[PDB]
DNA sequence: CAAGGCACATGACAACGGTGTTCAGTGCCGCGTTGCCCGATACCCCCTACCCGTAGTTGACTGGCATCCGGGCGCCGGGTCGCC
């Protein structure tokens, strides 16, 4: 996980933590689990590295209803949409050219120069209903 | 003269006003700590220059050295050969 800044142990540690975690997480709870591992990193520094990862683009970023920004990394480079369960957090990556063509067609119809789509589908889990 | 009819105001009724606080999220500036990058420095190599130890050099050449006295002074102590 290369970063724009000079490599060191702490960015490697947070990158490895993101690698192990395959769920949507917030910065504060990410720091909580990171401290639980025992690295004892700083809050604001963790912010810098996660922000850098979001800027780099190798980690997707989502915004919750509460307004918190949450992050998680994706195995595949190409763009995709993550279906996520609020209770579980199971993020599954899917993509469809139909929505892309729809966006381009709308942009052309309205004479828009450039666009950027943000589509996230929320829903109820299959196993959450079961008990 | 008493009972029945209409005005204004009234006991509550929430919801705005405006402003103060709550978790929480994320930075914004202050203090301190970190990967680089090089640059010099200790430490292997090769070469030869020079110090230092060993071994020969065949006419003949076969025993030295200069001592030492003007203490001075007395005693100890032992050796040392005569003595009868
Ligand atoms: Zn993604
Ligand atoms: Zn998309
Ligand atoms: Zn679920």
Q: For residues A103 and A97, give the distance between their C-alpha atoms in angstroms, rounded to a whole number.
A: 10
Q: Are A125 and A92 within 8 A, CB to CB?
A: no
d(CA A63, CA A82): 12
For nucleic chain B, give residues with Cβ below 7 angstroms from it.
A 6-9, 26-29, 43-44, 47, 51, 66-69
d(CA A37, CA A72): 18
Cα dihedral A11→A14→A20→A23 (10° resolution): -130
The CA-atom distances, in angstroms, between A28 and each of A31, A50, A87, A115, A121 are 5, 11, 18, 32, 24
- CA/C1' separation A91–B81 (Å): 137
Binding residues of A for Zn(2+), as ranges, are: 60, 74, 79-82, 85, 88, 93, 95, 100, 117, 125, 127-128
CA angle centred on A76, ends A59 and A80, rounded to 5°: 75
From CA A69, how far away is CA A63, in angstroms rounded?
5
Give the start-to-end residue ranges of the domains of chain A: 1-79, 80-131
Return the DSSP state at A90: B
């Amino acid at each position: 996980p290369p970063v724009k800044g000079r490599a060191t142990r702490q960015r490697a540690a947070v990158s490895a933590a993101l690698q192990e975690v395959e769920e949507f997480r917030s910065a504060q709870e990410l720091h909580d689990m990171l401290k639980h591992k025992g690295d004892a990193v700083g809050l604001t520094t963790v912010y810098r590295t996660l922000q850098s990862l979001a800027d780099a683009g190798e980690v997707d970023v989502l915004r919750t209803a509460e307004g918190e920004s949450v992050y998680r990394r994706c195995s595949t480079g190409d763009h995709h949409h993550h279906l996520v369960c609020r209770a579980c957090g199971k993020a599954v990556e899917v993509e469809g050219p139909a929505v892309e063509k729809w966006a381009e067609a709308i942009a052309a119809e309205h004479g828009y120069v450039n666009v950027a789509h943000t589509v996230e589908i929320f829903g109820t889990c299959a196993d959450c209903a079961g008990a």
